[PDB]
Design an enzyme around this catalytic site. Structure first.
Site, PDB file in Angstrom:
ATOM      1  N   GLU A   1       0.611   5.701   8.580  1.00  0.00           N
ATOM      2  CA  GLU A   1       0.634   4.765   9.708  1.00  0.00           C
ATOM      3  C   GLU A   1       1.243   5.171  11.056  1.00  0.00           C
ATOM      4  OE1 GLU A   1      -1.074   2.198   9.329  1.00  0.00           O
ATOM      5  OE2 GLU A   1      -1.183   1.890   7.123  1.00  0.00           O
TER       6      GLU A   1
ATOM      7  N   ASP B   1      -5.436  -1.366  16.128  1.00  0.00           N
ATOM      8  CA  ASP B   1      -5.876  -0.405  15.129  1.00  0.00           C
ATOM      9  C   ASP B   1      -7.294   0.049  15.418  1.00  0.00           C
ATOM     10  OD1 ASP B   1      -7.492  -2.399  14.138  1.00  0.00           O
ATOM     11  OD2 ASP B   1      -6.064  -2.909  12.509  1.00  0.00           O
TER      12      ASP B   1
ATOM     13  N   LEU C   1       0.766  -5.561  10.227  1.00  0.00           N
ATOM     14  CA  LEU C   1      -0.308  -6.394  10.790  1.00  0.00           C
ATOM     15  C   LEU C   1       0.230  -7.662  11.431  1.00  0.00           C
ATOM     16  CD1 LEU C   1      -3.297  -6.888  11.389  1.00  0.00           C
ATOM     17  CD2 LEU C   1      -3.555  -7.929   9.130  1.00  0.00           C
TER      18      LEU C   1
ATOM     19  N   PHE D   1      -1.123  -1.847   0.577  1.00  0.00           N
ATOM     20  CA  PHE D   1      -0.457  -2.106   1.848  1.00  0.00           C
ATOM     21  C   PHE D   1      -1.520  -2.258   2.979  1.00  0.00           C
ATOM     22  CE2 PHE D   1       3.553  -1.170   4.375  1.00  0.00           C
ATOM     23  CZ  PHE D   1       3.119  -0.673   5.594  1.00  0.00           C
TER      24      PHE D   1
ATOM     25  N   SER E   1     -14.043   1.143  -9.250  1.00  0.00           N
ATOM     26  CA  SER E   1     -13.055   2.170  -8.972  1.00  0.00           C
ATOM     27  C   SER E   1     -11.842   1.965  -9.868  1.00  0.00           C
ATOM     28  CB  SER E   1     -12.660   2.233  -7.509  1.00  0.00           C
ATOM     29  OG  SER E   1     -13.767   2.502  -6.654  1.00  0.00           O
TER      30      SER E   1
ATOM     31  N   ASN F   1     -16.454   6.546  -6.672  1.00  0.00           N
ATOM     32  CA  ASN F   1     -16.550   5.095  -6.505  1.00  0.00           C
ATOM     33  C   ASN F   1     -15.670   4.593  -5.345  1.00  0.00           C
ATOM     34  OD1 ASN F   1     -18.548   3.892  -8.533  1.00  0.00           O
ATOM     35  ND2 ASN F   1     -17.533   5.596  -9.584  1.00  0.00           N
TER      36      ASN F   1
END
Lengths: 162, 4
Positions: free
Chosen positions: A11, A20, A32, A104, A117, A132
């Site tokens: 990040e 972003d 966020l 996250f 997945s 996947n």
């Protein structure tokens, strides 16, 4: 090398409200604020998180703080979720961080949605989970990041971060 | 972000 260090790489750290790659507003270390286009709603979300008038700027210490709470919430999210928890429990230490990382970035319910997945990871089919993992909106959104996370799950090493 |  751990989740804290991995996320810092993924990040970055910005003390001022930023956008972003999707146009959403974030601050600090991937925190966020709001998906709404108005910078003012973002400032508002901000002062409520901090508890002060920030004018869209925070201390590094405040950033660190947020980050901790965020990593802590990502872990709580994995632990209470019926789909993610059995997966997580089954993973080694490196792969665990790769899952907390997706959580996250997308939330418990967003990661809980990667049905195929997760079936693969659960069964230790690393190459097939990677494939996947790539067929997703996530990967088309943030491929560079997604690529580092998928390599971690593939390999079980810190190779993509080194 | 966000499987689709």
């Amino acid at each position: 090398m751990n989740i804290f260090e991995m996320l810092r790489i993924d990040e970055g750290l910005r003390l001022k409200i930023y956008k972003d790659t999707e146009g959403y507003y974030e601050i600090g270390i991937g925190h966020l604020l709001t998906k709404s286009p108005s910078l003012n709603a973002a400032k508002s979300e901000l002062d409520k998180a901090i508890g002060r008038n920030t004018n869209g700027v925070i201390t590094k210490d405040e950033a660190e703080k947020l980050f901790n709470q965020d990593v802590d919430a990502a872990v709580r999210g994995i632990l209470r979720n019926a789909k993610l928890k059995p997966v997580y429990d089954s993973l080694d230490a490196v792969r665990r961080a790769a899952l907390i990382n997706m959580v996250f970035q997308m939330g418990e319910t967003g990661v809980a949605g990667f049905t195929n997945s997760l079936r693969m990871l659960q069964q230790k089919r690393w190459d097939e989970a990677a494939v996947n993992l790539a067929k997703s909106r996530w990967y088309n959104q943030t491929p560079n990041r997604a690529k580092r996370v998928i390599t971690t799950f593939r390999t079980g090493t810190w190779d993509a971060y080194k | 972000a966000x499987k689709x």
